Amino acid sequence: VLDLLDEECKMPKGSDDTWAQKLYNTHLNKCALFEKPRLSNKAFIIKHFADKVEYQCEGFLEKNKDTVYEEQ
Amino acid sequence: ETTALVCDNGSGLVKAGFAGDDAPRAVFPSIVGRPRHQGVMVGMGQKDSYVGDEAQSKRGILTLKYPIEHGIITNWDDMEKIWHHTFYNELRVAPEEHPTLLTEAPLNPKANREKMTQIMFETFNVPAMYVAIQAVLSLYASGRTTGIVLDSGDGVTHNVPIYEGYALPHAIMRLDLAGRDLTDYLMKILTERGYSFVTTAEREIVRDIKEKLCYVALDFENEMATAASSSSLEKSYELPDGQVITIGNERFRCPETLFQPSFIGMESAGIHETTYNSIMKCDIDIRKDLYANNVMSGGTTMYPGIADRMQKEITALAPSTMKIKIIAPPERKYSVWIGGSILASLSTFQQMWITKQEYDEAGPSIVHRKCF
Amino acid sequence: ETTALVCDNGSGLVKAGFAGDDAPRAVFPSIVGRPRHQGVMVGMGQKDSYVGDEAQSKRGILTLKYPIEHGIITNWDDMEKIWHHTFYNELRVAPEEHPTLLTEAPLNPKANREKMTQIMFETFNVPAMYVAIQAVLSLYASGRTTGIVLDSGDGVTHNVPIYEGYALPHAIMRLDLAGRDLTDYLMKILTERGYSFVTTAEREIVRDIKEKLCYVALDFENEMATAASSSSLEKSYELPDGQVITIGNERFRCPETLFQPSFIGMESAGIHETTYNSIMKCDIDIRKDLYANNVMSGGTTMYPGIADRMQKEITALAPSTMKIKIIAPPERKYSVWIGGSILASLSTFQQMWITKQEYDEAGPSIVHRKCF
Amino acid sequence: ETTALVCDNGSGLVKAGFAGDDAPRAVFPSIVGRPRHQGVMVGMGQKDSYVGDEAQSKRGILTLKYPIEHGIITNWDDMEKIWHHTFYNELRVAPEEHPTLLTEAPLNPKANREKMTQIMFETFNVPAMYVAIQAVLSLYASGRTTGIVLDSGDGVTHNVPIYEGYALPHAIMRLDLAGRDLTDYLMKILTERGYSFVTTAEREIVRDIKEKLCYVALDFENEMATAASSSSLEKSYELPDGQVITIGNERFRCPETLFQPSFIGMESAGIHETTYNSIMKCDIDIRKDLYANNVMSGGTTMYPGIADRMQKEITALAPSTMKIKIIAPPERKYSVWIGGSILASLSTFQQMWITKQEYDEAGPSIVHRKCF
Amino acid sequence: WXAXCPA
Amino acid sequence: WXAXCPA
Amino acid sequence: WXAXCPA
Numbered sequence A: 001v002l003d004l005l006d007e008e009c010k011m012p013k014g015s016d017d018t019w020a021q022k023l024y025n026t027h028l029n030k031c032a033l034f035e036k037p038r039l040s041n042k043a044f045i046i047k048h049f050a051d052k053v054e055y056q057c058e059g060f061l062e063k064n065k066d067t068v069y070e071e072q
Numbered sequence B, C, D: 001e002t003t004a005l006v007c008d009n010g011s012g013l014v015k016a017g018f019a020g021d022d023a024p025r026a027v028f029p030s031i032v033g034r035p036r037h038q039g040v041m042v043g044m045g046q047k048d049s050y051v052g053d054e055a056q057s058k059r060g061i062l063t064l065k066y067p068i069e070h071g072i073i074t075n076w077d078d079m080e081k082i083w084h085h086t087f088y089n090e091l092r093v094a095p096e097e098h099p100t101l102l103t104e105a106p107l108n109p110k111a112n113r114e115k116m117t118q119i120m121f122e123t124f125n126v127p128a129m130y131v132a133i134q135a136v137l138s139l140y141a142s143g144r145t146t147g148i149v150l151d152s153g154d155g156v157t158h159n160v161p162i163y164e165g166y167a168l169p170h171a172i173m174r175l176d177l178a179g180r181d182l183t184d185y186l187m188k189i190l191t192e193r194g195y196s197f198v199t200t201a202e203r204e205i206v207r208d209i210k211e212k213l214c215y216v217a218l219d220f221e222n223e224m225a226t227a228a229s230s231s232s233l234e235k236s237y238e239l240p241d242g243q244v245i246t247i248g249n250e251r252f253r254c255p256e257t258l259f260q261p262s263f264i265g266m267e268s269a270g271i272h273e274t275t276y277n278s279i280m281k282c283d284i285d286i287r288k289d290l291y292a293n294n295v296m297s298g299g300t301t302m303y304p305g306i307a308d309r310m311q312k313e314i315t316a317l318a319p320s321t322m323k324i325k326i327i328a329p330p331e332r333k334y335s336v337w338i339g340g341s342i343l344a345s346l347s348t349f350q351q352m353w354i355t356k357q358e359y360d361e362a363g364p365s366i367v368h369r370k371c372f
Numbered sequence E, F, G: 001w002x003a004x005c006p007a
C-alpha cells in the first residue's frame, strides 16, 4: 500500500481514485487481510492485529508528497 | 423504514431511484464499453470494462455494447454489471435491504423474466421483487384508470388498451420500430449529404443529432416540397471536433419513418394505424373512452409535432363524430418510472411482491403465475 | 539498493544515467573515430579507435562514423564500443548489477531489438532489461496521459497519438527528415555564399553553426523578402581557426525545410501536416483532446519560433472553433530520458523487465511479445 | 449504328469500351501525375500533367494522385482529365455520338452523381447517359437474377442482396476497407522486416508486390505457427532496381485484415460477418436462395483462397442444414464492366437513358428520380 | 467525405 | 430473439 | 534500411 502510494505520487495525473483502483487490482482477491468496503470505491479495509480499520483514500496523496527544491 | 427500489431497464437509459420520491436520482445509459486498443503506459489503473457515463466519457477508445435489444436482454454478464453498478455505485444502497421493482415490455420471452428473477434473488439476494408492464405504469403516472397507452422507448413500441384498470390482452400490439432503428436510419440518410457515421461512438453522435434537430412534419409531402424549394428549413450542428454539419430535409424525414415504416423496410403500418387497429379490437362500448384518452410515453414520443400529427391522422381514420385527444405531458420521458414510483409506494401493493420464501419453494417458474 | 540504468541511444548524443535521478550524468555524442594519418612519433600510446568526447577532441585527425543512422543501428561493433564506453567509462558501473532500460523509435526493424537484447544479455550479462518507445516517454516527462507527441532528434521524426494511456498504432506517423539531413542541407546552401564544408569534422562545425544561428520564420516569404532587402538579419560566426563567416537568409532558410521537405527533395509533407494527418486518423471523439495537447520532444524541436510556427499553421489546418495548444518545455531536449527515468523507477514496472531466465528459455524472440 | 460507351470509374483502374463487346478495350489506372523536379533541358516537349499509363511510365519524376478515394471523386479537374483522356485517346471516339453508361458504388453522396451528370452533359455534350450500381451489374455479368453480391475494388466494399431482380435497400452494407488500405497496411508491416516504401511510386511497387505474392490463409493461426517454425512459406521478389526482397508471413498476413479489420484499426467486422449480417436483414423466405448464391466481384476478391475461406467461415456462422455456395468466376475482376456491357445493349433499356432534353428541362436534379 | 472519413 | 428478429 | 533508404 505504501509502495503503490509512493508510485502514485510520481505517476502523471495520479489521483486518489486511480490509487484506490491500483489497490483493488493488486490486493482485492489476493490477500485475506485486505478488503474493499461494500458500498464505496474510495476506501479500503485492513485487518490489523486489534481490529479491522477502514481508511479513506481521499487525503493520502496530498499528505504523502514531500519534495523540497534545493534552491529554496 | 424500508423503501422499494424502482428500476426501469429500458434500452439506452437506465433510470432508477427510491419509491415515493418524484424523479429518478440515477439516470445513465445502459451501455458497457471494453477497451480495444493496445495499452502502452505502465501503471495507469487501466480497467477491464466501463459502465454508464464512464463508457460515454471514454467512448473514443471503447467498443460500446448495449446488453438489451428490443427489450430482450441478449448478454447477461453485462446486464449483471449494469445492475451491480446501479445499486452499489449510483444508488449506494445494499440490495439485501430493499424490495426491488423491475419493468419489462409485454409479449417478450418468458426466459427474460425467469432470468431477471433468478439473478435478483440468487446474486443480489434482494428480499422481494416484482415485474411490471411498462405501459400499465404510464397510467399510474398520468392519473388515469382508462386509456390506450402508446409507449416508445429505444427498441420496442407497444400499445396496451386499459379500461377501468382491466387490460385487454388480445388487443395488445407490439412493434420493434422505435428509437434505435431511427438512428440507424438517420445514419443512412445522412450519408446522402456526404457525412459518414460508422463507429459505435459516431452512432452516439447521431443519437444526439436526432435528439436535437429532428421534428415531425404535419404534412410530409408539403414540407418535402418546401425543403426542396428553399434553404429556410435547414439547420447546422457542431460535431465534437469542431467541424460543422448542415442538415436539411433529413431532420423531419427521419421521424416520418415512424408513420411509414416501409422506409426502413418493415411491412407493418405506422403507430397511428396500430393504435387505431388496437382500438378496433376493443368492444364497441369502450371505444368512445379510448378515443378520449391516448397517452404517449417514452423518449421516442418527444419529437416536436408528433402529437398534432397523431391527432390529425387518427382523426382522419376515426369516425367523424368523436373527440380524438392525444395526451403528451412534457415529463413523459420519465412517465414509466414515475408510475412505478407511485405503484411501489401503495399499501395494497405490499402483498404483491414475490418473496424469497416463495422463490425458494416454487423456483423461478413462480413469476409467471404471480406476476402478470 | 539497486537502481536501473536508463540509456537512450538516439543519434548524435548518447545520454545515460541512473533511474530516479533527474538529469543524465553522462551525455556525449554517439560517434566513433579511427585515425587515418600515418603515425610518425614512436612510443605515443596511439590507440585503435576513439569514442565520444575523445573523438570530438581529436576530430581533426579522425574519420568520424555514426553507428546509428535514422534510428537503425547500421554498425554493431561500434555500437558495442559505445555501450562499453558508456557503462565502464562514463557511469563507472558494472552492468551485471543493474537492470538496463533502452529506448527506441517506433516502426523500425525488429532485428534492431533482437540484436540489442542479444547483446545486452550475452556480452554485458545485464540481469534484466526493457525496450521503450521514445515518444511514450515524453508524456511521462511532461506529466500527461493524453496528447499527440511530436518528436524529432537527429534522424527519425515520428508522431504518436496517445489518449488516456492507450496508443493508436494505426495513426503513428514516421518521417526520416529530422536533424542530420538538415545539416547536410545547410552544408549545401552554404556553398552558394562561398563556404565549403566537406569533411566529417566540417560537418560537426556546420552542426554547431546550425545549433547557434538557425531559427524558424513565422512567415517564410516575408522574411525572405526582408533578408533580400537588408543586412539587418545577418549574423557572423567564428570558425575554430579564427576565420569569420557571415550567414544571411540561410539561417532561417535551413529549418524551413522541416515544413517544406521538397527543398531536400522528399515527397512527403511537413511535420505540421503529418501532425494534422495523424490526428485525422484518430476517431472524432478524441480529436478535441489531442488538439489541446501537442508535446514537442528532442533537439530538432529547439529552433526559436518552431512552436509558434507549428501552432500558426496547425491553427490554419484545424477547424476554426478549437484551441490548438503546443507544449514545448525548455527542457524538452532531455524529455525522453527524464521520462524513462520516471518509468524505470515505478514499482508497477518491476514486473515488466525481461529477465535472463526468460531470455534463456525463449531466446531474443521474446522481446516482441513482452516488450511493446 | 450508334453503340453506347460503357465506363466504370472505380478506383485504380479505369476500364472502358463499347456496349456489346465482351471485354474493355481501354484499361488503365485512374492516376494523374504532375512533375515535381526542376526541368533542366530546354526544348524537351515537357508537359504539364500525365494521365494513366503515361504517369505509370514516368512515375519516378511524378507525384501521383488518385482523383477518386473510396468511390467519392475528391478532385474534379483531374477526373475531367481522365475522362477526356479516355474518350479521345483511349477509345478515339467523339462523345457527342454515343450514349454513355457510368457506374457507381451504392450509398455514396448524391453530389457525386449530380456533378458526373452536369459534366457529361455540359462539357462532353454526351447525348444521353445513365448511372448504374456496381453490384447490380455483377449479376448481369454472372447470369443470375438472385444472390447477395459481395464486391470489392480499390476503396469501397459493399454487399447488395438481390432476389428475382428486386433490390433490398435496407440490407445494403458498405465498407471502406478494401484494396488501397490493404496496400497502406502492407507498407507498414513490411517495415518490420526492414523495407521502407514511402513515396507514391513505392506505393505502386507495394501494390505490385501485393498482387503477386499475397494469398489468404485457410486458418490464420495454423499458418502463423507454421511460418514461425519454418522457411517453407517464404518468397522473394525483385524490385525495379534489381534489389531482391524476401517476404515471409507478411504475404498471408496482409489480406487477413479483410477478415479482421481491427489490424488496421477499424471497428467493424470482416466481409464474412457483413455478408451474414446482410442476409440476416432479408426476410426468412428468401435467405435459402441467398445462401445458395454468393457472387464475388472486383479485384480485391482475387486473392488465392479467399473463396474457400469465405465459404468456411460463413458455413461456420450459418445454420448447419443449408448449402453455402460461393461463386467466384476467374473473370470476376471485369464483372461490373461485362454486366454494364450487357445492360447497355438491351432494347428495353433504350427508354431508361436520361436525354439532354430532360436535363435541359429538369436540371441535374433529375438523376435522383430517373436513375436508381 | 465531409465528416467521418477523409474523402 | 430466437428466430425471427436478431435478438 | 534494406530497400527504400540507405540504412
Ligand SMILES: Nc1ncnc2c1ncn2[C@@H]1O[C@H](COP(=O)(O)OP(=O)(O)O)[C@@H](O)[C@H]1O
Residues within 6 Å of the ligand: B009, B010, B011, B012, B013, B014, B152, B153, B154, B155, B179, B180, B207, B210, B211, B212, B297, B298, B299, B300, B302, B303, B333
Ligand atoms: N428529446 C428527444 N427527442 C427525440 N428522441 C429522444 C429524445 N430523448 C430521447 N430520445 C431517444 O429515445 C430513446 C430513449 O427513450 P427512453 O424512454 O429513455 O428509452 P427506454 O424506455 O428504453 O429507457 C433513445 O433512442 C433516445 O435517442
Ligand SMILES: Nc1ncnc2c1ncn2[C@@H]1O[C@H](COP(=O)(O)OP(=O)(O)O)[C@@H](O)[C@H]1O
Residues within 6 Å of the ligand: C009, C010, C011, C012, C013, C014, C152, C153, C154, C155, C179, C180, C207, C210, C211, C212, C298, C299, C300, C302, C303, C333
Ligand atoms: N539548440 C539547438 N537548436 C537546434 N538544433 C539542435 C539544438 N541542439 C541540438 N540540435 C540538433 O538536434 C539533434 C540532436 O537531438 P537529440 O535529441 O540529442 O538526438 P537524439 O534524440 O537522437 O539523441 C542534432 O542534429 C543537433 O544538431
Ligand SMILES: Nc1ncnc2c1ncn2[C@@H]1O[C@H](COP(=O)(O)OP(=O)(O)O)[C@@H](O)[C@H]1O
Residues within 6 Å of the ligand: D009, D010, D011, D012, D013, D014, D152, D153, D154, D155, D179, D180, D207, D210, D211, D212, D298, D299, D300, D302, D303, D333
Ligand atoms: N490479382 C490480384 N490480387 C490481389 N489484388 C489485386 C489483384 N488485381 C488487382 N488487385 C487490387 O484490387 C484493386 C483493383 O480492383 P478494381 O476492381 O480494378 O478496382 P475498381 O473496382 O475500383 O476499378 C487494387 O487495389 C489492386 O491492387
Ligand SMILES: [Mg+2]
Residues within 6 Å of the ligand: B010, B134, B152, B153, B297, B298, B299, B336
Ligand atoms: Mg420507456
Ligand SMILES: [Mg+2]
Residues within 6 Å of the ligand: C010, C134, C152, C153, C297, C298, C299, C336
Ligand atoms: Mg530523442
Ligand SMILES: [Mg+2]
Residues within 6 Å of the ligand: D008, D010, D011, D134, D152, D153, D298, D336
Ligand atoms: Mg469496381
